[PDB]
Amino acid sequence: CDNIKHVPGGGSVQIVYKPVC
Amino acid sequence: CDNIKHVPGGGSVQIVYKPVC
Amino acid sequence: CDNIKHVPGGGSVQIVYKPVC
Amino acid sequence: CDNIKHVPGGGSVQIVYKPVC
Amino acid sequence: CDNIKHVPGGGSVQIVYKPVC
Amino acid sequence: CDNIKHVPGGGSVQIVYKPVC
Amino acid sequence: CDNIKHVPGGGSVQIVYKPVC
Amino acid sequence: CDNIKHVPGGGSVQIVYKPVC
Amino acid sequence: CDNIKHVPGGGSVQIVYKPVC
Amino acid sequence: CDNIKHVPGGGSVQIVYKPVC
Amino acid sequence: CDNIKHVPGGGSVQIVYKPVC
Amino acid sequence: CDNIKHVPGGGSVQIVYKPVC
Amino acid sequence: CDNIKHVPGGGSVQIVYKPVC
Amino acid sequence: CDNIKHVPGGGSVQIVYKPVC
Amino acid sequence: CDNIKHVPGGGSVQIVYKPVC
Ligand SMILES: *Cc1cccc(C*)c1
Ligand SMILES: *Cc1cccc(C*)c1
Ligand SMILES: *Cc1cccc(C*)c1
Ligand SMILES: *Cc1cccc(C*)c1
Ligand SMILES: *Cc1cccc(C*)c1
Ligand SMILES: *Cc1cccc(C*)c1
Ligand SMILES: *Cc1cccc(C*)c1
Ligand SMILES: *Cc1cccc(C*)c1
Ligand SMILES: *Cc1cccc(C*)c1
Ligand SMILES: *Cc1cccc(C*)c1
Ligand SMILES: *Cc1cccc(C*)c1
Ligand SMILES: *Cc1cccc(C*)c1
Ligand SMILES: *Cc1cccc(C*)c1
Ligand SMILES: *Cc1cccc(C*)c1
Ligand SMILES: *Cc1cccc(C*)c1
């Protein structure tokens, strides 16, 4: 990804599986 | 992705499977 | 990834499996 | 990755498996 | 990785398995 | 691919070129 | 692909070229 | 790939070239 | 790959070139 | 690879070139 | 791409972003 | 890419970002 | 890439970022 | 890459970052 | 890489960073 601004102001969960970035 | 501004102001869950970005 | 600004202001979990970055 | 600014202001967990960076 | 600024302001756990950086 | 049950009961040939799975 | 049940009961040939799955 | 059950009951050939899994 | 059950009951050949798993 | 159960019950050949696992 | 014969006889510029070939 | 014959007879610039070939 | 014949007859610049070949 | 014939007949610059070949 | 024939007939610069060949 690029220039991602992930600011949930709360619970944050990121679950990925076999990605190709 | 590009220039993503993810600001839910609350619970944030991201679940991905075998992506190709 | 590039220029990621991950600031949830809370619980942060990152789970990855066999990625290719 | 590059230029990652991981500042959750809270609990931070990073779990990776067989990555290729 | 490069230029990683990991400042959670809290509990920090990093678990990796057979990476290729 | 996921949950592939390849049971031809005979000759089986799989030829792939530069895939992105 | 998902939940593929390939059971030809005979000769099976699969030829692919530069796929994106 | 995941949960692949490759049981041809016969000749099995798998030929791959520059994959990205 | 994960959970691969390769049981051809016969001749088994696997040929790979410059993979990225 | 993980949890690979390679039981061909016969001739088994594995040929790899410059992999990145 | 395959069998590309790029012969502009002049200035040639190719700019790509996050492709999936 | 395959069988690319890039012969511009002049200035040649190739700029790519996070490709998946 | 395969069988690339890059013959610009002039200035040649190749710039890549985090590729997956 | 394979069988690359890079013959620019001039200035040649190759710049790569975190590749996976 | 394999069978690379890098013959620019001029200035040649190769700059790489954290590759995985
Ligand atoms: C943007 C992004 C998030 C998680 C994993 C990847 C490969 C990319
Ligand atoms: C934008 C994005 C989110 C999660 C995963 C990917 C590959 C991309
Ligand atoms: C952006 C990113 C997060 C976690 C793992 C990878 C390979 C990339
Ligand atoms: C950005 C990143 C996080 C954890 C592991 C890797 C290989 C990369
Ligand atoms: C960025 C990074 C974190 C942990 C392990 C590796 C190889 C890389
Ligand atoms: C399902 C599958 C078969 C062969 C190659 C790939 C990448 C995927
Ligand atoms: C379902 C399937 C068969 C062969 C190749 C791919 C990428 C997918
Ligand atoms: C499912 C699979 C078979 C052969 C090669 C790859 C990368 C994946
Ligand atoms: C599933 C698999 C078979 C052969 C080679 C690789 C990298 C993966
Ligand atoms: C699953 C596997 C078989 C042969 C070589 C590699 C790197 C992986
Ligand atoms: C044909 C082609 C040109 C540039 C980039 C890609 C992925 C493909
Ligand atoms: C054909 C091609 C040109 C530049 C980069 C890639 C991955 C492919
Ligand atoms: C064909 C090619 C040019 C530059 C970089 C890669 C990974 C591939
Ligand atoms: C074809 C090629 C050029 C530069 C770097 C890589 C990994 C591959
Ligand atoms: C083909 C090639 C050029 C420079 C560095 C690597 C790892 C590969």
- The three-state secondary structure class of F6 is strand
What is the SS3 assignment for chain O? CECCEECCCCCEEEECCCCEC
Q: Which residues line ligand 8 (CB under 6 A)?
A: F 1, 21; H 1, 4, 14, 16, 19, 21; I 1, 19, 21
Give the method used.
cryo-EM
Nearest-5° Cα angle at I9, I7 to I13: 70
Burial F1-21 (b: 16+ CB within 10 A, else e): bbebebbbbebbbbebbbbbb
User: Using CB atoms within 10 A of its CB, is residue E18 exposed (0-12), middle (13-18) or buried (19+)?
Assistant: exposed
Burial of K5 (0-12, 13-18, 19+ CB in 10 A): exposed
Tokens representing residue D12 in the block: 């931070």
Resolution (angstroms) stands at: 3.2
Which residue in chain H is spatially nearest to I1 when comparing CA positions?
H1
Q: Is E15 in the pocket of ligand 5 (CB under 6 A)?
A: no
Neighbours of O17 (CB within 10 A): 12
